Amino acid sequence: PTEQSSAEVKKIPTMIEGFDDISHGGLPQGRTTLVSGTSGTGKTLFAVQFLYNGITIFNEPGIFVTFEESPQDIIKNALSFGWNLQSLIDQGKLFILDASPDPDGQEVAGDFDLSALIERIQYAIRKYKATRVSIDSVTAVFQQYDAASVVRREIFRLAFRLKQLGVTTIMTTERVDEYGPVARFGVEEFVSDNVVILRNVLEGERRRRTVEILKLRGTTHMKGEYPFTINNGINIFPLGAMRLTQRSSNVRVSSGVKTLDEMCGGGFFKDSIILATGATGTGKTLLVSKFLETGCQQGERALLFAYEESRAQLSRNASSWGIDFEELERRGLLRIICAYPESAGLEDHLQIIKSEIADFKPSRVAIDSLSALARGVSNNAFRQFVIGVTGFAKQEEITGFFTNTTDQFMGSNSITESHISTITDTILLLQYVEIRGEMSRAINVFKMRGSWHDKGIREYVITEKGAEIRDSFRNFEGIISGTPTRISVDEKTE
Amino acid sequence: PTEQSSAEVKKIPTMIEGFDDISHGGLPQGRTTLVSGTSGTGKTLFAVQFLYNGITIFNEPGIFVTFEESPQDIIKNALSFGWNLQSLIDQGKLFILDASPDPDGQEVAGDFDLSALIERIQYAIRKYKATRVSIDSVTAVFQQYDAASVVRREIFRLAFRLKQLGVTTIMTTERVDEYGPVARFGVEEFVSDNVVILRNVLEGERRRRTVEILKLRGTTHMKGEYPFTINNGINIFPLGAMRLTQRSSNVRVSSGVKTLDEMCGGGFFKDSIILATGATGTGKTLLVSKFLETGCQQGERALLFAYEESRAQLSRNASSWGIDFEELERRGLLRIICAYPESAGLEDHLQIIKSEIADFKPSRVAIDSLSALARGVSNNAFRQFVIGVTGFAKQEEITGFFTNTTDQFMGSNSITESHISTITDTILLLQYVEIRGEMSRAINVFKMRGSWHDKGIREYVITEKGAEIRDSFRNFEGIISGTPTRISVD
Ligand SMILES: Nc1ncnc2c1ncn2[C@@H]1O[C@H](COP(=O)(O)OP(=O)(O)OP(=O)(O)O)[C@@H](O)[C@H]1O
Ligand SMILES: Nc1ncnc2c1ncn2[C@@H]1O[C@H](COP(=O)(O)OP(=O)(O)OP(=O)(O)O)[C@@H](O)[C@H]1O
Ligand SMILES: Nc1ncnc2c1ncn2[C@@H]1O[C@H](COP(=O)(O)OP(=O)(O)OP(=O)(O)O)[C@@H](O)[C@H]1O
Ligand SMILES: Nc1ncnc2c1ncn2[C@@H]1O[C@H](COP(=O)(O)OP(=O)(O)OP(=O)(O)O)[C@@H](O)[C@H]1O
Ligand SMILES: [Mg+2]
Ligand SMILES: [Mg+2]
Ligand SMILES: [Mg+2]
Ligand SMILES: [Mg+2]
């Protein structure tokens, strides 16, 4: 059960978060891997992290060859991630080779004599006993006056003699267009055993970082683009490798509303995702406030992500329901993260949610309006976002509370117009009901995945005491229409 | 002068799965075939698998000519599929011709190409008595040459000398565009008799590999792009060629709910595809759980593909219905999978689903939420998936249970919004009904191709003992609306 052999192609772990999953183990040992991308896309970082993680986790000496940036500038830039390459240079584990051109000529005639640096790189590998090599900005060395034929053979020589020395290599190349050729000369990608493509695409004034493994000769890999973020190095979150393997339990928590707990047969599940959906002014934010307030009353932390209202505006409205966000914040039981949805990409939004959750370590998490985050973005990006947040919440055993404002008050025949209701364990439906020329409100627990729930579409009023849930309209027809018909006949009472 | 032909053009089988069907036989014999594509499309695999299948199956010696990749790499990379290439080389069946240049460097003697290359290849053809030849990356020896007219002659001269020796050739060529010109110099297409194109198109963030036969002179072939995956090599699925050749029987199978069995006139068919459609929280997964359980109570094995719930959560919800999942993997009768829809493309999903079948060989198979796999993908690509999956179970006599959540919880006028109900044998319809200010739910067997079924829209209740199916709303109208009205002029 390995099985069916063989020696074949094995991989060297990069320990870049999420990469070893999409590469099914890492980079092919003893081979050169081509990392391609446009400006400021993370190539230069990819090569350094490949060396840095090899030295401090596997004790494998590395050599970094630079043709543009100075050695001191590479060391200085890496300090932003909290690691210093100088100590490794001092220990003799890391060697930064300056192949950068002297600010004068000449010139030469094919520029470099080659052979050495190929001897230079060779000499460095011998001296420091290195197994990993990163060559940064290979493209820059070519542009003197080189047809695609010369560039093809030159990469081949480099890759070949580095293959002799049994060294895994990362080669960095530049792109101009985001979806055109893989490289600048449209040839490098064919001569390379392995090709990784780093992309920085627009999409409506927001930016999105994606990584893709185009080909790994002699082995397997995940295919397509994958979202990543620059943070503590390269942070790839495979949207699919997040194993559909989270726990579950029959433990219950309260909503803060007594009747709503009875309606859910004892309250929400600790291991659940709750969706409060309905028109505007219905009371989605009120239920969020009570859901968080109860956690604090238990001594556990609550974390709120608001995208529509500010803290002072949230604290004012909440106070009118008797609850004090102000005091709960300064004690460290409640944290309110207010941000504009359009301020960053949904991938960047996801990082902040993860980071804040890890820092604060809450037992309850609420997002005021997922629908607010769904504006101006593709449904694919948004649905991908929800999976990320929903899955990560279920993974950390944190109770999730999400709200969704429907664009359609009265007569909405859909729970959510972005269709994410299949990712949620619990759905609370809120809607307007027209009773005698006045706008009433009704609440319905649409579904409880692991529980019995009340079936009634029950009227509720909002007061200082909060949500007062009452009886269902038992003499009306077409309540979910929003416009009921009173049918007190047949009177059926003699 | 006396004709002597005497039928038409003959083809040799490549034995690459699915290729011989779209090629209407194979590759035109004694002629060169151009296999073109971008980087990482499968050109080298096609070239290698062509020789490997020609040696291990037909005992026909082959020659592999390389200009870039070294023999050792070709041998080592082929080990990925379990192809012992070195043993073949020892037997004298395979010979890898290394025409790669020097890592030292030279230019002028690029004209000695062909002229000396042809002589070596044909010597090797005679030495090993080879009938098949693969030349990988004939593009490499084109250092732009002298424009494209020089390229035109060189390709022509090569294919001609191979023609005289009576060998079937595969020449691979690189291209930078997926839908641009077929080759680099925009000439290769017209000089070659046969043109095969491998594509690796994006369309979103998932890759999709397709193979197309553009032209085969003197012969016929299937037209257009065909989806293929790589596992044992190139595995082409002529999803539109699996001619409707499946068995069918009147053997009945139980769903798990006795009241439903009677509604379906005795129960499901063993040769069936059952679709359960409805809004969220209606009970599709509940009926799925019953369908899989019932088979494992018969000693029969079941397979579940979950795309929205986890094994722990599936177990929790089921255990609440009195359905113990945990003992079913214990017996080894039930096998969960659990994967994310976005993890791979739909072709990779199909393949994975197929492999689990081959591994297990299930009697019953359920795929929870087909609607989940229809997200962010064209309906044309979704239907291809459904047909492949649905058709596969019909081939293996496997009972198919599929689910689909409708985006509208009431007022829904359609079974599916993907329009795949036309290719489903049985349809059970779930919906919410507003009865007296509360949310009731109703089960309806919409259609069944080989059986009588209950025509009633029956009220059902979900309890700790599963679904209890009750009466039809005899006193109501507009139940389909979701908002019925009580009538009693009766
Ligand atoms: N501490 C940090 N946190 C977040 N992002 C960072 C940090 N440091 C750098 N970055 C990001 O990394 C990007 C630069 O990446 P890097 O220099 O590694 O490769 P590159 O810019 O693609 O190479 P080049 O453009 O020189 O070919 C910048 O756009 C910057 O936004
Ligand atoms: N002090 C109060 N007394 C009575 N009713 C109140 C009081 N404060 C607010 N309400 C009611 O609550 C509604 C506001 O609900 P809330 O702000 O909690 O969520 P929401 O309106 O769903 O949020 P969104 O702005 O996203 O729609 C108002 O329409 C108002 O009718
Ligand atoms: N064991 C395997 N399982 C699945 N896919 C594999 C396996 N081994 C290789 N592959 C796939 O094969 C592809 C490489 O194809 P191959 O090298 O045969 O031709 P090519 O890439 O067209 O050649 P080139 O691009 O160098 O001209 C890779 O993208 C990889 O995904
Ligand atoms: N112990 C229980 N008692 C009563 N009803 C239950 C119980 N467990 C579940 N239910 C009902 O079953 C429904 C869940 O159905 P199930 O999870 O089988 O599929 P589904 O909800 O249709 O799938 P989807 O996630 O696509 O909505 C809930 O809405 C709930 O009303
Ligand atoms: Mg850099
Ligand atoms: Mg609000
Ligand atoms: Mg190749
Ligand atoms: Mg379900």
Report the distance separating Cα A91 and Cα A51, nearest Å: 14
Tokens representing B393?
């179970």
For residue A242, list chain B residues with Cβ-Cβ distance below 8 A: 340
Residue whose CA is closest, atom 25 of ligand 4? A422
Distance of CA A246 to the CA centre of its chain: 18
Report the distance separating Cα A182 and Cα B176, nearest Å: 9
Helix, strand, or coil here: A85? coil
Among the partner residues B174, B207, B320, nearest to A190 by beta-carbon distance: B174
Q: Where are the alpha helices (DSSP H) in B18-165?
A: 19-22, 43-56, 71-78, 85-91, 117-127, 149-164
Helix, strand, or coil here: B211? strand
Strand partners, A216: A194
Distance of CA A387 to the CA centre of its chain: 10
Helices B71-78/B43-56 angle, 10° precision: 80
- Catalytic annotation, residues of A: 68, 308
Tokens representing B48?
């290698």
Q: What's the half-sphere exposure (Cβ side, CA atoms, 13 Å) at B276?
A: 26
Report the distance separating Cα A121 and Cα A95, nearest Å: 10
Binding-site positions of A read 39-45, 80, 215-217, 219, 221, 280-286, 308, 321, 441, 447-449, 451, 453, 455
Task: Answer yes or no: is the C-beta of B309 below 6 A from any ligand 4 atom.
Answer: no
The vertex-A253 CA angle with A252 and A258, nearest 5°, equals 110
What are the Cα distances from residue A440, in Å, to A280, A289, A413, B467? Answer: 13, 21, 18, 33
Strand partners, B468: B461
Residue-level length of chain A: 494
Helix H or strand E segment including B351 = helix B346-360
Tell me the CA–centroid distance for residue A274 and ligand 8, in Å: 15
Could you tell me if B291 and B325 are in contact, meaning their C-beta atoms sit under 8 angstroms apart?
no
Tokens representing A128?
């420091």
In sequence order, which residues have a C-beta less than 8 Å from that of residue A332 and are 6 or more positions away? Answer: A301
Tokens representing A364?
């309850």
Radius of gyration, CA atoms only, chain A: 29
Among the partner residues A153, A240, A421, nearest to B342 by beta-carbon distance: A240
Distance of CA A125 to the CA centre of its chain: 37
Among the partner residues A9, A220, A384, nearest to B342 by beta-carbon distance: A384
What are the Cα distances from residue A232, in Å, to A78, A229, A355? Answer: 10, 9, 11
Atom of ligand 1 nearest to the CA of A172: 27
Tokens representing B458?
């029956």
Report the distance separating Cα B307 and Cα B301, nearest Å: 20
Report the distance separating Cα A32 and Cα A192, nearest Å: 7
For residue A421, list chain B residues with Cβ-Cβ distance below 8 A: 280, 405
Residue with tokens 């192609």: A9
Q: Is the dihedral of CA A232, A10, A165, B104 positive or negative?
A: negative
Atom of ligand 3 nearest to the CA of B46: 18
Nearest to A197 by CA among A32, A52, A33, A68: A33
Tokens representing B96?
């890898």
Task: Sketch the domain layout of chain B as residue ranges.
Answer: 1-239, 240-490
Report the distance separating Cα A414 and Cα B406, nearest Å: 9
Report the distance separating Cα B404 and Cα B54, nearest Å: 45
Strand partners, B476: B486
Report the distance separating Cα A42 and Cα A86, nearest Å: 21
The amino acid at residue A17 is E
Tell me the CA–centroid distance for residue A250 and ligand 4, in Å: 15
Could you tell me if B30 and B163 are in contact, meaning their C-beta atoms sit under 8 angstroms apart?
yes
Strands B62-66 and B132-136: parallel
In sequence order, which residues have a C-beta less than 8 Å from that of residue A337 and are 6 or more positions away? Answer: A303, A304, A305, A306, A352, A356
Distance of CA A275 to the CA centre of its chain: 21
Tokens representing B155?
């390709």
Q: Is the peptide bond before A490 cis (omega within 30 degrees of 0)?
A: yes
What are the Cα distances from residue A452, in Å, to A263, A449, A490, B281, B464? Answer: 8, 8, 32, 11, 8
Tokens representing A223?
């295919």
Helix, strand, or coil here: A489? coil
Tokens representing A439?
């706008």
Helix, strand, or coil here: A136? strand
Q: Where are the alpha helices (DSSP H) in A138-257?
A: 148-164, 188-191
Residue B8 appears among annotated catalytic residues: no
With CB atoms and an 8 Å threshold, state whether B40 touches A214.
yes
Nearest to B159 by CA among B177, B179, B178, B173: B173
Strand partners, B449: none
Chain A nearest C-alpha distance from B173 (Å): 11
Could you tell me if A222 and A432 are in contact, meaning their C-beta atoms sit under 8 angstroms apart?
no
Report the distance separating Cα A469 and Cα A465, nearest Å: 11
Could you tell me if B378 and B384 are in contact, meaning their C-beta atoms sit under 8 angstroms apart?
no
> What is the number of other CB atoms lying within 10 angstroms of the CB of residue A110?
13
Binding-site positions of A for Mg(2+) read 44, 285, 308
Could you tell me if B49 and B170 are in contact, meaning their C-beta atoms sit under 8 angstroms apart?
no
Q: Where are the alpha helices (DSSP H) in B165-227?
A: 188-191
Helix H or strand E segment including A22 = helix A19-22
The vertex-B314 CA angle with B311 and B316, nearest 5°, equals 110
Tokens representing A271?
């291991």
Nearest to B365 by CA among B265, B257, B268: B268
Strand partners, A476: A486
What are the Cα distances from residue A327, in Å, to A300, A335, A464, B212? Answer: 15, 11, 19, 68
Could you tell me if B210 and B73 are in contact, meaning their C-beta atoms sit under 8 angstroms apart?
no
Helix H or strand E segment including A354 = helix A346-360
Q: Where are the alpha helices (DSSP H) in A187-275?
A: 188-191, 258-263
Helix/strand/coil percentages in chain A, nearest 5: 30, 25, 45
Residue-level length of chain B: 490
Nearest to A123 by CA among A141, A97, A142, A102: A97
CATH code 3.40.50.300 for B240-490: yes
Among the partner residues B40, B317, B410, nearest to A449 by beta-carbon distance: B317
Report the distance separating Cα A356 and Cα A352, nearest Å: 6
For residue A485, list chain B residues with Cβ-Cβ distance below 8 A: 485
Residue with tokens 């004209």: B111
Nearest to A221 by CA among A194, A245, A242: A194
Residue with tokens 């291209």: B175
Tokens representing B184?
């680099």
Report the distance separating Cα A9 and Cα A5, nearest Å: 11
Tokens representing B380?
């044309």
Helix, strand, or coil here: B381? helix
Helix, strand, or coil here: B121? helix
Q: Is the dihedral of CA B274, B277, B280, B282 positive or negative?
A: negative
The amino acid at residue A280 is T
With CB atoms and an 8 Å threshold, state whether B483 touches A487.
no
Judged on CB neighbours under 10 Å (0-12, 13-18, 19+), A79 is exposed
Among all bound ligands, the one having the nearest atom to the CA of A276 is 2
CATH code 3.40.50.150 for A240-494: no
Report the distance separating Cα A26 and Cα B431, nearest Å: 48
Report the distance separating Cα B451 and Cα B274, nearest Å: 13
Across A352-373, b (16+ Cβ under 10 Å) vs e yields: ebbebbeeeebbbbbbbbbbbb
Nearest to A257 by CA among A283, A279, A220: A283
Helix, strand, or coil here: B151? helix
Nearest to B36 by CA among B223, B160, B215, B235: B215
Across B70-108, b (16+ Cβ under 10 Å) vs e yields: ebebbbbbbbbbebebbebeeeebbbbbebbbeeeeeee
Report the distance separating Cα B40 and Cα A140, nearest Å: 25
Judged on CB neighbours under 10 Å (0-12, 13-18, 19+), B112 is exposed
Tokens representing B91?
């037997």
What are the Cα distances from residue B436, in Å, to A381, A442, B219, B483? Answer: 40, 14, 70, 10
Q: Which of B69, B174, B189, B308 is catalytic?
A: B308
Report the distance separating Cα A43 and Cα A41, nearest Å: 6
Helices B346-360/B379-395 angle, 10° precision: 10
Strand partners, B169: B32, B133
List phi, psi (to 5°) of A166.
Answer: 65, 40
For residue B320, list chain A residues with Cβ-Cβ distance below 8 A: 250, 450-451
Residue B178 appears among annotated catalytic residues: no
Could you tell me if B57 and B17 are in contact, meaning their C-beta atoms sit under 8 angstroms apart?
no
Task: Answer yes or no: is the C-beta of A283 below 6 A from any ligand 2 atom.
Answer: yes
Domain boundaries B1-239, corresponding CATH code:
3.40.50.300
Report the distance separating Cα A17 and Cα A233, nearest Å: 8
> What is the number of other CB atoms lying within 10 angstroms of the CB of residue B48?
26
Nearest to A54 by CA among A11, A23, A97: A11
Report the distance separating Cα B127 and Cα B406, nearest Å: 66
Distance of CA B452 to the CA centre of its chain: 34
Helix H or strand E segment including A269 = strand A268-269
Report the distance separating Cα A456 and Cα A409, nearest Å: 20
Tokens representing B291?
């369908």
Query: In sequence order, what DSSP letters do the residues of B248-293 get, joined into one string?
Result: ----EE--S-HHHHHHTTSSEESS-EEEEEESTTSSHHHHHHHHHH
Widest Cα–Cα separation across chain B: 102
Could you tell me if B283 and B430 are in contact, meaning their C-beta atoms sit under 8 angstroms apart?
yes
Strand partners, A287: none
Strands A273-278 and A426-435: parallel
Strand positions, DSSP E, A280-370:
302-306, 334-338, 364-368
Helix, strand, or coil here: B235? strand
CA distance from start to end of chain A: 78
Helix, strand, or coil here: A289? helix
Task: Answer yes or no: is the C-beta of A449 below 6 A from any ligand 4 atom.
Answer: yes
The amino acid at residue B144 is Q
Nearest to A65 by CA among A171, A197, A194, A178: A171
> What is the number of other CB atoms lying within 10 angstroms of the CB of residue A8?
14
List phi, psi (to 5°) of B315.
Answer: -65, -40
Chain B nearest C-alpha distance from A247 (Å): 5
Method: X-ray
Helices A346-360/A379-395 angle, 10° precision: 10
What are the Cα distances from residue A64, in Å, to A56, A70, A231, B469? Answer: 15, 11, 22, 70
Radius of gyration, CA atoms only, chain B: 29
Across B364-375, b (16+ Cβ under 10 Å) vs e yields: bbbbbbbbbbbb
Q: What's the half-sphere exposure (Cβ side, CA atoms, 13 Å) at B320?
A: 18
Helix H or strand E segment including B331 = helix B326-331
What are the Cα distances from residue A371, in Å, to A292, A376, A402, B259, B349? Answer: 20, 11, 9, 41, 30
Nearest to A372 by CA among A352, A394, A343, A351: A343
Report the distance separating Cα A456 and Cα B435, nearest Å: 9
What are the Cα distances from residue A204, in Å, to A201, A207, A372? Answer: 10, 8, 16
Strands A458-463 and A62-66: unpaired
Nearest to B237 by CA among B73, B350, B365, B124: B350
Report the distance separating Cα A212 and Cα A33, nearest Å: 13
Report the distance separating Cα A328 and Cα A347, nearest Å: 29
Report the distance separating Cα A450 and Cα A248, nearest Å: 10
Report the distance separating Cα A68 and Cα A98, nearest Å: 8
Question: What is the 3-state secondary structure of B443-460?
Answer: EEEEEECCCCCCCCCEEE
Report the distance separating Cα A160 and Cα A191, nearest Å: 11
Strands A476-477 and A485-486: antiparallel
